[PDB]
């Protein structure tokens, strides 16, 4: 199967704007012919999670 057939969504808003926040995206999947036929469920990665804004929040006096 071609996993790139079903496009990924956009990276969501960073949970924490600083101090190592997290964000995630996922493929856009609608149940149809190509999906069930080509076994796109088992051999494809449907999610990608990443840490965002790992720079420490500025410490002010």
Ligand X SMILES: *[C@@H]1O[C@@H](C)[C@@H](O)[C@@H](O)[C@@H]1O
Q: Binding residue for ligand X (CB under 6 A) from 3, 43, 49, 57? A: 57
x/- string (CB under 6 A) for ligand MAN, residues 3-32? -x--xx------------------------
Name the minimum Å distance from CB 44 to ligand MAN.
10
What SS3 string covers the chain?
CCHHHCCECCCCCCCCCCCCEEEEEEECCCCCHHHHHHCCCCCCCCEEEEEECCCCCCCCC
Contacting residues toward ligand X, per CB under 6 A: 17-18, 57
């Amino acid at each position: 199967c071609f996993c790139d057939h079903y496009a990924w969504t956009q990276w969501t808003s960073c949970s924490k704007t600083c101090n190592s926040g997290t964000q995630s995206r996922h493929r856009q999947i609608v149940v149809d012919k190509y999906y069930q036929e080509n076994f796109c469920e088992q051999i494809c990665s449907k999610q990608e999670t990443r840490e965002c804004n790992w720079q420490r929040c500025p410490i002010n006096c």
